[PDB]
Amino acid sequence: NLRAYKFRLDPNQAQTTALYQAVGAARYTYNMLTAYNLEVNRLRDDYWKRRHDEDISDADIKKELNALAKEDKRYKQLNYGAFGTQYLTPEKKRHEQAEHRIENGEDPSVVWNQETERSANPWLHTANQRVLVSGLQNASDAWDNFWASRTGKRAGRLVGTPRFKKKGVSRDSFTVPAPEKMGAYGTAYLRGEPAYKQGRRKITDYRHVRLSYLGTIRTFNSTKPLVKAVVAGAKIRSYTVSRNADRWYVSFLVKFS
DNA sequence: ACCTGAACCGGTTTCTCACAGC
DNA sequence: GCTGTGAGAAAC
RNA sequence: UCGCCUCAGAAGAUAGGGAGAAACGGACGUAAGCGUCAAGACCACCGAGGGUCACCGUAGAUGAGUAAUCAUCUGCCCAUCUAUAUGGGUGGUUCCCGGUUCAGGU
Numbered sequence: 040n041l042r043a044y045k046f047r048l049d050p051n052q053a054q055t056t057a058l059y060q061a062v063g064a065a066r067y068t069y070n071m072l073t074a075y076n077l078e079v080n081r082l083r084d085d086y087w088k089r090r091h092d093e094d095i096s097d098a099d100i101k102k103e104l105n106a107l108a109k110e111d112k113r114y115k116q117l118n119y120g121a122f123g124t125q126y127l128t129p130e131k132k133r134h135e136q137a138e139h140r141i142e143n144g145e146d147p148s149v150v151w152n153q154e155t156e157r158s159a160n161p162w163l164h165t166a167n168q169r170v171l172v173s174g175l176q177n178a179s180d181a182w183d184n185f186w187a188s189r190t191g192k193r194a195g196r197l198v199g200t201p202r203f204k205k206k207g208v209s210r211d212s213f214t215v216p217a218p219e220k221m222g223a224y225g226t227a228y229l230r231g232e233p234a235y236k237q238g239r240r241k242i243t244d245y246r247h248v249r250l251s252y253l254g255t256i257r258t259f260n261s262t263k264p265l266v267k268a269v270v271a272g273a274k275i276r277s278y279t280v281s282r283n284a285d286r287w288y289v290s291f292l293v294k295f296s
Numbered sequence: 297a298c299c300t301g302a303a304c305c306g307g308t309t310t311c312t313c314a315c316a317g318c
Numbered sequence: 319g320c321t322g323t324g325a326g327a328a329a330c
Numbered sequence: 331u332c333g334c335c336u337c338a339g340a341a342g343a344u345a346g347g348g349a350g351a352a353a354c355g356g357a358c359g360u361a362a363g364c365g366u367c368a369a370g371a372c373c374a375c376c377g378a379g380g381g382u383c384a385c386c387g388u389a390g391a392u393g394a395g396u397a398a399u400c401a402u403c404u405g406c407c408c409a410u411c412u413a414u415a416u417g418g419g420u421g422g423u424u425c426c427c428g429g430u431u432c433a434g435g436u
Contacts, residue, residue, distance in 0.1 A: 041305090041428085042427055043428035044426095044427085045339080045426080045427075051380070052379075053380090121330085123328095124330075128329090168327055168329095169326095177431085180430060181432080184303095184304085184430080184431060184432085188303090195301090195302060196301095196432090197432095198431075198432050199431080199433060201432085210430090210431095214307085217308090218308070219326095220324085224401090227324090229324090229325075230314085230323095230324065231315080231325090233381095234380090243394060243395090243400075243401065244399085245401090246382080246400090251326095252325075257381085257382090258339085259338080261386085263386085276307085277306080277307070279429060281429080283297090290428055292306055292428075294306080297436100298436075299434105301434085302431105303431090303432100304429105304430085305428105305429080305430085306428085307330105308330085309329090309330090311327085313324105313325090313327105314323105314324095315324095316320100316321100316322105316323095316324105318319105318320100
């Protein structure tokens, strides 16, 4: 019983900048996860081929791989959460230390250089957790989708290999969930935003939606159907922000009940 | 960038700062 | 000037 | 009088940069690229940034806002459904369900 109210956003420069930073962060996390999986499976297939010279069955190799799930973790694949905890906030702390050691005078070239990493300065620790973990969501979904397509589950043609996303070749989009604060008419603002400096506290019309740490953003549509659905026993679930060419869209997933 | 084309599905929970509304 | 409430990180 | 791109979430009324004479064809600067400009109203700062509409027939009330605009009820009109000429109830031109990934063609 799920609908989707797809509004066309009407953001401004200060909000489009955060949207671009968000899609960049999701893409960057997507790339790290897919790379980790890719050069884990390269070793996987090299080992499988190098042990294929001697005839082996499928149960024996499965038992061996299961027994190799405690040591030499190079034979393991990670979800969004496990990879996040194990390799993302370590790198967030690495970025933080790279600022905690350039505070007032230091050598940044020995700490951060644009040779092995295309970042001008560290920025991964000042990125919102929701946006960052969205890329983990997408990458884990793609890899599980393909390993389900292979074995026995997904009907249709064989499904490719996960391709590294690029700026202008792939899709830009991130999902931000509840129980964060979001919604149409009848919802409160954010403390500290330029619309809270003026003191305004609640949405009292039909051309605004609430988008978490991004503030409250306008729409091209009208939210009267959304609010009239809300006052029947129906509550929003998440919001997905997406880009098409130079246009931004937001989907509000409502669950009527 | 613009589509098919198809196949599948639609987020919770907790602990720690910083105004705030007098 | 004080303490619940909101906003955001962290795990997951 | 016509219509190729451009602003109004998509199609039918009103605005945008230049042309054509119901036919053809986006523009400017610099065989090519590249960059840039194209919707009106109110306050805010020294041509730059932020909110409001570009959906809601027709008359009132008082709600939020320095204000553009907006909200909720009460009169009238029209359209649309059910139960037995009457009671109610739904609107003010209609439509909308979107995310993820890969393989293709343009």
